[PDB]
Symmetry: C2
Subunit: 201 residues, 2 copies
Amino acid sequence: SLSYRIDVLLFNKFETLDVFGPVEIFGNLQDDFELNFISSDGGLVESSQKVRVETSLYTRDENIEKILFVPGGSGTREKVNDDNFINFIGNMVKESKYIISVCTGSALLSKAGILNGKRATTNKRSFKWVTEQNEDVLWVKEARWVKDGNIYTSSGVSAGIDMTLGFIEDLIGKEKALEISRSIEYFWNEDSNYDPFSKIY
Amino acid sequence: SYRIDVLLFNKFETLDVFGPVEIFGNLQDDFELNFISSDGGLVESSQKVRVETSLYTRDENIEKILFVPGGSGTREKVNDDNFINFIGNMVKESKYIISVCTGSALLSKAGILNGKRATTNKRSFKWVTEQNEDVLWVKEARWVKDGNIYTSSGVSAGIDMTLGFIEDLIGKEKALEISRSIEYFWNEDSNYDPFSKIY
């Protein structure tokens, strides 16, 4: 048992990059993080771009600190209006130390009510859709990503990867995040505040 | 239009594969994604992602694109005479060949790169390059187009090359469209890899 378990939540029609860019970063700190791919049913889950990934069921541990990671994608359109799924998420949040979302994953966290009275963001293309669902969230329009306590939310796919490296900086130290960037040859925009895509909407 | 044969093997690099898949998979009227491996079934990435694959299958009703990622797995995989011949067999049959990272160590081993301009990630440049002196390796490039062959360096190069490929093949507007809808910041310059500096 290491320090952290990352519970990567997959569901039907998740966005491929929302999940895999961050995984590429977390999956390169294997003495720090236990990667756990979960979904409501276990088995293979298909992304919106047709990749099928093996997953398992969420299990509780008193024992290890848990980071819940919640991606976006088409599938949120229907997952928001699925009470049973939203209960699932809330169950998992109640138990996690850290909570991370990319894109419309924040719509799901919003529905679970965990972001009420919290600063958070979502991708710019879906900003209206997401935000108008919940007023009690201190939505932030322009940010690439927002940290609010132990909650980290981000916008589109670039922001989601850059946020993850930011999360590593916060948690493991910036020297580590840079080492990862350099070794996989990923260009990291450390600025979390100006999303150039906020512009066209 | 095209079937993209994305070749997985044990310990592939996750982002080598899923960055480009995000792009291609956003043009589902132009490309059909087909994840293959030598055995079929589940293949695991170096980051522990298990992805389902099928066996390669011949079709002559559709043009094919062969996509080859890098990752740790390539060090062992350059040895598989069969694997390499498998690739060559597939290359012989494809309209385009694309690689990211050490994927080009494998393309090279198939000798497909002999006489061609090509690149690979900067961190592994020595190791890849010394395997074959008959390839015209380009050190400073993020990616390199030589004919119907496209090779890329690191993970960001991998995605930006895929958008460049979409531009070449389908038109630049479609490329910008995708990048804007998924909100991916696309670095269009294929020429100066900042990671060349390190090595």
